[PDB]
A paper describes a structure:
The highly conserved eukaryotic multifunctional polymerase-associated factor 1 (Paf1) complex (Paf1C) was originally identified in budding yeast over 2 decades ago1, and robust data suggested that it plays a vital role in transcriptional elongation and chromatin modifications. In this study, we determine the atomic structures of both the human PAF1/CTR9 and yeast Paf1/Ctr9 heterodimers, both with a resolution of ~2.53 Å. Our analysis revealed that both the hook-shaped (hookfold) PAF1(57–116) and Paf1(34–103) occupied the concave channel and convex surface of the right-handed superhelix-folded CTR9(1–249) and Ctr9(1–313), respectively, with very similar conformations, although the sequence identity was low between human PAF1 and yeast Paf1 or CTR9 and Ctr9. Our results clearly reveal that the heterodimer of PAF1/CTR9 or Paf1/Ctr9 is the core component and is important for human PAF1C or yeast Paf1C assembly, yeast viability, and Paf1C-mediated histone modifications.
Next, we used the same approach by creating a single polypeptide through fusing Ctr9(1–313) to the N-terminus of Paf1(34–103) with a TEV-cleavable segment. The crystal structure of Ctr9(1–313)–Paf1(34–103) was determined at a resolution of 2.53 Å with one molecule in the asymmetric unit. Superimposition of the structures of the yeast Ctr9(1–313)–Paf1(34–103) and human CTR9(1–249)–PAF1(57–116) heterodimers resulted in a root-mean-square deviation of 2.63 Å for 198 equivalent Cα atoms, indicating that human CTR9/PAF1 and yeast Ctr9/Paf1 subcomplexes share similar heterodimer structures. Similar to human CTR9/PAF1 subcomplex interactions, the Ctr9(1–313)/Paf1(34–103) interface could be divided into three regions. In detail, region I was also mainly maintained by hydrophobic interaction through four conserved hydrophobic amino acids in Paf1 and corresponding amino acids in Ctr9, and by hydrogen bonds between D61/Q150 and K191, M64/K191, and D67/N104. Substitution of these four amino acids in Paf1 with serines (L62S, M64S, V66S, and L68S, referred to 4S) led to the complete disruption of Paf1/Ctr9 subcomplex formation (lane 3 in Fig. 4h). In this region, Paf1 had a longer loop than other species (e.g., worm to human), including a shorter α-helix (αC') that bound the N-terminal tail of Ctr9, which is different from human CTR9/PAF1 complex. Notably, the [Ctr9(N16Δ)] mutant did not form complex with Paf1 thoroughly, indicating that this longer N-terminal tail of Ctr9 is essential to maintain the interaction between Ctr9 and Paf1. For region III, D95 was the core amino acid in the C-terminus αD' of Paf1, which bound with R221, R243, and Y10 of Ctr9, mainly mediated by extensive hydrogen bonds. D95K mutation in Paf1 also abolished the interaction between Ctr9 and Paf1 completely (lane 5 in Fig. 4h).
Author numbering: 10 to 264, 283 to 295, 299 to 308, 1041 to 1102
Write the structure that this text describes.
Amino acid sequence: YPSMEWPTSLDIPLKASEELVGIDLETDLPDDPTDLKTLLVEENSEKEHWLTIALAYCNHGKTNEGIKLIEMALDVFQNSERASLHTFLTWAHLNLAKGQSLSVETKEHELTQAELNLKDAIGFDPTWIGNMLATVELYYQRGHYDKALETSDLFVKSIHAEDHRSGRQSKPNCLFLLLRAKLLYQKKNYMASLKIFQELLVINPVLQPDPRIGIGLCFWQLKDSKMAIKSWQRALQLNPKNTSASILVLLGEFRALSDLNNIFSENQVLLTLLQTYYQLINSLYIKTNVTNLIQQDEDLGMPVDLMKFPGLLNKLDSKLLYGFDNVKLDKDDRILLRDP
Ligand code: NI
Ligand code: NI
Ligand code: NI
């Protein structure tokens, strides 16, 4: 398959001489990012290096450190050079805000921090795709689905208008499509949603988040529970760290029994599963409950995270948002292109 893996090391050009200090992004980052700040400031390092480093923290479980670094960068870079620092801070706070167990206030507190940085970013660079996507993602995360879909639809018209103005053909943007597919599913238009998720599978079969999660949720809401489960097992196969896939595969296959999956649910919901330990009125109760909690995550198991796109938040290169042009679409993926 195609590859969206981040460069795994960084060379910082030293200021006085012309040697380069190499950093292994996966083991060389210190617990206190101030150490690099010293280096980065001292050697007059370029801004994109601050970003690349902060993204390494975030993508290796260290978002607080990622945030601490770019917040320090804000004391170094001036005026318009601060825009892309604010964009990073927007997406870092959107990632925080997706925290699995935040109370509605902590969520909104993090989303406010994102919005504040977003305002500073758009003030300098309103047409940057990183800032436009964040505007839509903020509406989504706040549940304002109608405004999100309407803002999305204005944005793609704008970009289309812009391609006439530069004599270019438009290329579908995977995250605008992903946002549309998710908004459509919120509006219960599961058929239009499913088509977009399937479009995404052929454009970028290594897209994060996995559009197969959405493929399965569309099948499920369209009552083809057999294929929903196949989409989800394909997701969990290509990436066994996908917790959302895991919980969906087991909640789906779980339609004695209520022991076999509490033990499989401890490997990687477990509350209400234990509430359901409390004429088969009962079988419809466990059935309803499994359905309710398969639908409990308003994020649909597909968190939109710009930190999964090499070059995007650290170099203003949005190329990877358009995916790949040859589709070796594997046997177990091409199945998922089918109708219900
Ligand atoms: Ni914060
Ligand atoms: Ni905070
Ligand atoms: Ni046109």
